Amino acid sequence: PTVVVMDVSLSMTRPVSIEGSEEYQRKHLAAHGLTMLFEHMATNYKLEFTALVVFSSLWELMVPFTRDYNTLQEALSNMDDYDKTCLESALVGVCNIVQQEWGGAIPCQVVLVTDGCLGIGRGSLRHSLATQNQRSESNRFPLPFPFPSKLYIMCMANLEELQSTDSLECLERLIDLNNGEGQIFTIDGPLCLKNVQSMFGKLIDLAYTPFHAVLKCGHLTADVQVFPRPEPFVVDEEIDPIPKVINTDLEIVGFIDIADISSPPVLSRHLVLPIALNKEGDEVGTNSANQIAGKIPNFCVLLHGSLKVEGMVAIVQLGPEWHGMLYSQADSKKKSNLMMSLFEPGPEPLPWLGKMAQLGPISDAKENPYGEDDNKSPFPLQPKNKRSYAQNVTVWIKPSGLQTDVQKILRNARKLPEKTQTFYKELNRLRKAALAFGFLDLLKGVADMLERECTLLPETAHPDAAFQLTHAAQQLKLASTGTSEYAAYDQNITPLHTDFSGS
Amino acid sequence: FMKIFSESHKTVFVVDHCPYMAESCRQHVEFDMLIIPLAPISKSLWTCSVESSMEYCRIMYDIFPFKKLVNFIVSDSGAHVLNSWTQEDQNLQELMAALAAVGPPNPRADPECCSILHGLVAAVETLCKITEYQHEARTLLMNAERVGNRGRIICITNAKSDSHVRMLEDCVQETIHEHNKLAANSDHLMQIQKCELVLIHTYPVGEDSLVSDRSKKELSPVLTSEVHSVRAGRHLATKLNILVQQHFDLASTTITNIPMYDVELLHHKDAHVDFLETITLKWCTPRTNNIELHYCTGAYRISPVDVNSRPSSCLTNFLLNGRSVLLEQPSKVISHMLSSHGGEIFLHVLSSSRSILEDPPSISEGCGGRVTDYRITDFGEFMRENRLTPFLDPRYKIDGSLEVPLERAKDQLEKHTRYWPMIISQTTIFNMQAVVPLASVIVKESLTEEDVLNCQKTIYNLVDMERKNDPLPISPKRDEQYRIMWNELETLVRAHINNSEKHQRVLECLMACRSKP
């Protein structure tokens, strides 16, 4: 998204040229520049959300985030004039309106339009930059922006004017406080409409050029737009320092059911929309143009329609060892169109899928891994070693943890010889854990409890129960000594082979 | 520096096995619940420190199955390294067997030359040994091995006094200094650029601690030391539970409203970066059919603090069975999701804010949006037939440079789309059920003998249809229909004649049977 921060202070009413070369005031060339920007967005960057903030002594959100660039254009008409500037307070508001709408992970571009005349005093920028260190968290400086940001400063004053009053140094200081993310735009010449249009034209080429690509699935192709333009990605500055840009040819390499991809973590999501091109790569002269393109079968429509009906995603090759997925809007009561998510670069972004390079066609398989009735799936891949929650582990730190193990042993002790196998598995489970932790006194205590259970066996009990309880209780005491008997970790307690079953 | 090779890459536990470690922590354990109840029993200091350190390694191994290695050392009359740096030796089951083999400390044993110093020296020496991940990074750079080598030594013992503790620190400092000189002149060792020493003094409950706490102190440009005084038992386990969160940047999440108490999970702190000490998330009632594909900005492995408690067991077993859980922050806001992936439970970070991709352009108003006869059904079958499947062992069909499965999947998509009209009105043969036996196999790399017969039988049937003058779905004259139909079938077959010589014979069969060109 974009937040336009427009200066409406009194200094913006100064003439653009005291020589009378043009009649505009600073605020009029600012409106002309923003008009050029909004008109470009309305035709070549339609989906961008843009808000308009005006600031003087106070700041006001004049237009909240919108794609209606007519209402943004109409906001530049007959703008009121005010007084001093208070740039820091408006930049606080920029932080608020951005996080309040998009959170803190969505890249936003802040376009500050001012003449650099920010004055001296309380709300001045020269004072705010001097008192940057103090106040700590209660009144912290808005820069750097908590969200990924670019701070573009469109100066409605030429380079000679900005340098003559140290105003340029303050504007350059703002970008340095934003980690160099941004750019100052100045005119080293006469302030005029021609040079301001050239200035905003450079902002357009830098920050609002749509990303074109070609979506391919074998011989099925479509010229597409990827919105928003993907941010160049740097993995590890020490190991892999080159910023990664997705391949212009978006090659589909296979398909995976939505249930198998699960909900993978992705870097970003982007809409993939077809564009009408011609011989020179021009986008159809940026209603008759869209009607002609509307009746030409496009692979995006076929792909998106099939992906939604089939509930599937299309794996895309973004580059060497970089992949992503194309899919349809999964909420079925919202509007749906084709979009793309980028995985973390690397050969194994998702463990449950394995190495992307080892994903092949089912034709090369011996049997169809999804089943003849499409009732199975080779996914998810399982990790070679189980985790502690998917496996039996012994934890006796809390007293309730130990009482649970002895109660499971006691319950199965009262159900013999029916539960003989699980009784001896829970018994050896506690035996091994006691030998590992060196908690041999527990073995004596459990053996005493098994002896008590044997004596308290009801007269209506199976005869084998008394034999196995005393056998387990005696073999557990012999393990509590430490002298090599059943004190060895590998030697399990086996039940007595009593002949009570039918001979 | 090195990113993965920070302090947490190498962790070395040093627990003393000396006779005095058999002393009772004097914290009674009630194992018998309800006759005359049995007398409660107490664990030893050695048992308390082995419990707390193994629980430390349980939480780490769940959250970091790779690249976070541990060396477990016990110290008595000598040092005993129970496992190496290899990822294969990062196994709790094998550690328990090794701990059982060394057994408990003998109270009536010779306490001479029995000292924690043995394992402390062994901790310094193993920190200089190369791990598998470090060895692979060395082979890569050949930036010529700027590979960082850092570590952390967690030492649990029962010290005499602060003077005794400072002596342990000075011994570690002098040992790191001297052994780094030996490691520098060795082809298969690495110097210790940074080391954090954590000395944990534990003692039975009811006593007064003979060792006092001391914050982090810089003893050397390499070594930072820090001591802790904590009662054995529950207090000692609570200390290592806090230390595992600091050493690996772990955050805590408490799940409430679990229908069946509350469950606390540990994970990397990045799972709460998007949101903003514990984060409370409410269990959302799982709708029978919710959204299948969630936009996820991050998935982080978890580990339950109370892995065996009934509330946490019910939660984890619910996830392991296959169902997911949506989490809500106290309309409403669903911010996270718990989901198991082949037995491994991840904490998914979801998007709660407004989507910049909301209200997309209409399909109907974009390119090709006014076309009504897209072969959505047929292309849906295309996607099912070109689904990916994992291959584990390297495979081939000839011999030479090995064959990559994903390249073969990409190649199959090329052959399958050499002739694939996107709309119904642009094709005739793909609207005829009689063409299916030929069209489905003619795109194959090589034809089986039964494939050839079915291709010929398809062509023979089309001659029968042309003789009976059956109507065709061409989207005009009957003679003109089959001419167009034969031309289209010829186009499809010629798109694959270079696949094999059998493909060429299928074309010879087509050219001889079709209406005279």
Annotate A419-479 with DSSP letters as a single string: THHHHHHHHHHHHHHHHHHT-HHHHHHHHHHHHHHHHT--TTS-HHHHHHHHHHHHHHHHH
CATH of the domain at B13: 3.40.50.410
**Between the CA of residue A130 and those of A133, A165, A174, B420, what are the distances in Å?**
8, 16, 12, 67
If asked whether residues B505 and B384 sit together in one domain, one would say yes
Sign of CA dihedral A278, A282, A287, A291: positive
Please list, in sequence order, all residues whose beta carbon lies within 8 angstroms of the beta carbon of residue A71, skipping any fewer than 6 positions away: A63
**Residue where the block lists tokens 């007959």:** A78
Contact B90, B83 (CB under 8 A): yes
What's the token pair of residue B380?
């849906």
A463-480 and A440-455 helices, crossing angle to 10°: 160
B501-513 and B449-468 helices, crossing angle to 10°: 10
If asked whether residues B161 and B300 sit together in one domain, one would say no
Q: Which of B46, B366, B376 sits opposite A273 (nearest CB)?
A: B366
Specify the CATH number for A211-236+243-364; select among 1.10.10, 2.60.40, 2.30.29, 2.40.290: 2.40.290
Contact A472, A424 (CB under 8 A): yes
Q: How many CB pairs under 8 A join A and B?
A: 387
Q: Classify residue A408 as exposed, middle or buried by CB count within 10 Å of its CB (0-12, 13-18, 19+).
A: middle
DSSP assigned state of A265:
B
If asked whether residues B170 and B71 sit together in one domain, one would say yes
Per CB-CB distance under 8 Å, the chain A contacts of B309 are 398, 400-401
Contact A20, A94 (CB under 8 A): no
Please list, in sequence order, all residues whose beta carbon lies within 8 angstroms of the beta carbon of residue B476, skipping any fewer than 6 positions away: none
User: Is B63 contained in some domain?
Assistant: yes
Contact A266, A341 (CB under 8 A): yes
Domain boundaries, chain A: 2-207, 211-236+243-364, 390-480
Residues B455-463: contacts with CB under 8 Å, at least 24 apart: B455/B506, B455/B509, B456/B506, B456/B509, B458/B434, B459/B506, B459/B509, B459/B510, B459/B513, B460/B513, B461/B434, B462/B434, B462/B435, B462/B486, B462/B489, B462/B513, B463/B513
Please list, in sequence order, all residues whose beta carbon lies within 8 angstroms of the beta carbon of residue A207, skipping any fewer than 6 positions away: A109, A150, A152
List the one residue out of A352, A284, A503, A456 whose CA is nearest residue B341.
Answer: A352
**Contact flag B406-A360 (C-beta cutoff 8 Å):** yes
If asked whether residues B309 and B396 sit together in one domain, one would say no
List the one residue out of B333, B378, B338 whose CA is nearest residue B351.
Answer: B333
Edge-to-edge order in the sheet of strand A108-114: A59-66, A50-55, A2-7, A108-114, A149-155, A182-185
B45-63 and B234-247 helices, crossing angle to 10°: 30
Q: Which of A106, A219, A364 sits opposite B417 (nearest CB)?
A: A219
List the one residue out of B56, B73, B69, B57 whose CA is nearest residue B14.
Answer: B73
Could you give the CA distance from residue B250 to residue A372 in angstroms, rounded to a whole number?
45
Q: Residue A95 carries which side chain, given as an amino acid letter?
A: C
List the one residue out of A349, A352, A299 whose CA is nearest residue A321.
Answer: A349
Phi, psi (degrees; rounded to nearest 5) at A467: -65, -45
Compute the nearest-CA separation of B470 from chain A (Å): 29
Which helix (H) or strand (E) segment holds residue B47: the answer is: helix B45-63
List the one residue out of B481, B496, B499 whose CA is nearest residue B432.
Answer: B481
If asked whether residues B445 and B322 sit together in one domain, one would say no
Q: Rg of chain A over CA atoms, in angstroms?
A: 36
List the one residue out of B490, B495, B494 whose CA is nearest residue B510.
Answer: B490
Contact B350, B296 (CB under 8 A): yes
Phi, psi (degrees; rounded to nearest 5) at B139: -65, -35
Resolution in A: 2.5
Q: Classify residue B464 as exposed, middle or buried by CB count within 10 Å of its CB (0-12, 13-18, 19+).
A: exposed
Could you give the CA distance from residue A129 to residue A141 in angstroms, rounded to a whole number?
9
**Between the CA of residue B32 and those of A200, A450, A457, B1, B45, what are the distances in Å?**
80, 11, 17, 53, 22
Distance from the Cα of residue B88 to its chain's centroid? 16
Which helix (H) or strand (E) segment holds residue A185: the answer is: strand A182-185
HEC secondary structure over A218-250: CCEEEEEEEECCCCCECCCCCCCCCCECCCCEE
Q: Which of A253, A313, A387 sits opposite B62 (nearest CB)?
A: A387
Taking CA atoms, what residue in A is nearest to B28? Answer: A399
**Residue where the block lists tokens 């200089």:** B128
Sign of CA dihedral A121, A125, A127, A131: positive
Q: Which of B42, B343, B385 sits opposite A386 (nearest CB)?
A: B343
**Contact flag B31-A442 (C-beta cutoff 8 Å):** yes
Compute the nearest-CA separation of B341 from chain A (Å): 6
| Beta strands at B303-304 and B388-390: parallel, antiparallel or unpaired | unpaired
Could you give the CA distance from residue A245 to residue A318 in angstroms, rounded to a whole number?
8
Contact A61, A188 (CB under 8 A): no
If asked whether residues B139 and B26 sit together in one domain, one would say yes
If asked whether residues B395 and B415 sit together in one domain, one would say yes
If asked whether residues B242 and B303 sit together in one domain, one would say no
HEC secondary structure over A124-157: CHHHHHHCCCCCCCCCCCCCCCCCCEEEEEEECC
List the one residue out of B47, B48, B84, B88 whose CA is nearest residue B66.
Answer: B88
Q: What angle do CA A297, B292, B284 make, to 5 degrees?
A: 150
Phi, psi (degrees; rounded to nearest 5) at A109: -115, 120
Contact B193, B134 (CB under 8 A): no
Please list, in sequence order, all residues whose beta carbon lies within 8 angstroms of the beta carbon of residue A44, skipping any fewer than 6 positions away: A208, A209, A210, A283, A286
If asked whether residues B405 and B454 sit together in one domain, one would say yes
Task: Give the best residue of A338, A387, A408, A480 to mutate against chain B (max B CB count within 10 A).
Answer: A387
Task: Give the best residue of A3, A212, A257, A262 to mutate against chain B (max B CB count within 10 A).
Answer: A262
Please list, in sequence order, all residues whose beta carbon lies within 8 angstroms of the beta carbon of residue A468, skipping any fewer than 6 positions away: A416, A417, A420, A423, A495, A496, A498
Task: Give the best residue of B48, B367, B381 to mutate against chain A (max A CB count within 10 A).
Answer: B367
What's the token pair of residue A495?
């039940």
Instruction: Decide: helix, strand or coil at residue A120.
Output: coil
Q: How many CA atoms lie within 13 A of A462 on its CB side?
A: 17
Name where chain B breaks: residue before each gap, C-N > 2.5 Å. Answer: 34, 142, 260, 276, 330, 475
Per CB-CB distance under 8 Å, the chain B contacts of A361 are 386, 388-389, 405, 408-409, 412
Q: How far apart are the first and last CA of chain B?
A: 74
Taking CA atoms, what residue in A is nearest to B373? Answer: A297
Count of CB atoms situated within 10 Å of the CB of B310: 13
Per CB-CB distance under 8 Å, the chain A contacts of B329 are none
The method of structure determination was X-ray
Residues of the binding site of A for Mg(2+): 9, 11, 85
Could you give the CA distance from residue B195 to residue B148 in angstroms, rounded to a whole number?
12
Contact A220, A45 (CB under 8 A): no
Please list, in sequence order, all residues whose beta carbon lies within 8 angstroms of the beta carbon of residue B381, skipping any fewer than 6 positions away: none
**Between the CA of residue A503 and those of A424, A500, B134, B208, B444, what are the distances in Å?**
24, 8, 64, 66, 64
Task: Extract the runs of DSSP E, i.e. beta strands, from B204-306.
Answer: 214-218, 223-231, 250-256, 263-268, 279-284, 296-301, 303-304
Please list, in sequence order, all residues whose beta carbon lies within 8 angstroms of the beta carbon of residue B89, skipping any fewer than 6 positions away: B83
Could you give the CA distance from residue A389 to residue A378 in angstroms, rounded to a whole number?
23
Compute the nearest-CA separation of B170 from chain A (Å): 31
User: Is B73 contained in some domain?
Assistant: yes
* Overall number of domains in chain B: 3
DSSP assigned state of B365:
G
Contact A121, A84 (CB under 8 A): yes
Q: Residue B247 carries which side chain, given as an amino acid letter?
A: H
Q: How far apart are the first and last CA of chain A?
A: 83
Range of the structural domain that residue B446 is part of? 367-513
Q: Which of A310, A330, A436 sits opposite B291 (nearest CB)?
A: A330
**Contact flag B384-A310 (C-beta cutoff 8 Å):** yes
List the one residue out of A300, A276, A102 whose CA is nearest residue B362.
Answer: A300
Per CB-CB distance under 8 Å, the chain A contacts of B293 are 258, 261, 263, 313, 327, 330
Could you give the CA distance from residue B75 to residue A423 in angstroms, rounded to a whole number?
36
Count of CB atoms situated within 10 Å of the CB of B279: 18
Could you give the CA distance from residue B92 to residue A116 in angstroms, rounded to a whole number?
64
List the one residue out of B256, B269, B258, B245 whose CA is nearest residue B317.
Answer: B258
User: Is B360 contained in some domain?
Assistant: no
**Between the CA of residue B176 and those of A404, B171, B195, B382, what are the distances in Å?**
45, 9, 9, 64
Q: What angle do CA A237, A241, A242 make, to 5 degrees?
A: 145
Q: What angle do CA B482, B483, B488 make, to 5 degrees?
A: 90
Q: What angle do CA B27, B32, B35 make, to 5 degrees?
A: 130
Q: How many CA atoms lie within 13 A of B481 on its CB side?
A: 18
Q: How many CA atoms lie within 13 A of A332 on its CB side?
A: 7
Could you give the CA distance from residue B34 to residue B272 in angstroms, rounded to a whole number?
44
User: Is B433 contained in some domain?
Assistant: yes
Compute the nearest-CA separation of B466 from chain A (Å): 31
If asked whether residues B172 and B225 sit together in one domain, one would say yes
Overall CATH class of domain A2-207: alpha beta
Count of CB atoms situated within 10 Å of the CB of A67: 16
Could you give the CA distance from residue B190 to residue B151 in angstroms, rounded to a whole number?
12
Q: Residue A338 carries which side chain, given as an amino acid letter?
A: L
If asked whether residues B258 and B244 sit together in one domain, one would say no
- Across the strands, what pairs with A165? none
**Contact flag A251-B91 (C-beta cutoff 8 Å):** no
Taking CA atoms, what residue in B is nearest to A275? Answer: B367
User: Is B1 contained in some domain?
Assistant: no
Could you give the CA distance from residue A390 to residue A270 in angstroms, rounded to a whole number?
36
| Beta strands at A312-319 and A220-227: parallel, antiparallel or unpaired | unpaired
What's the token pair of residue A51?
């808000």
What's the token pair of residue B111?
């306490």
If asked whether residues B211 and B338 sit together in one domain, one would say no
Q: Which of B51, B100, B417 sits opposite A218 (nearest CB)?
A: B417
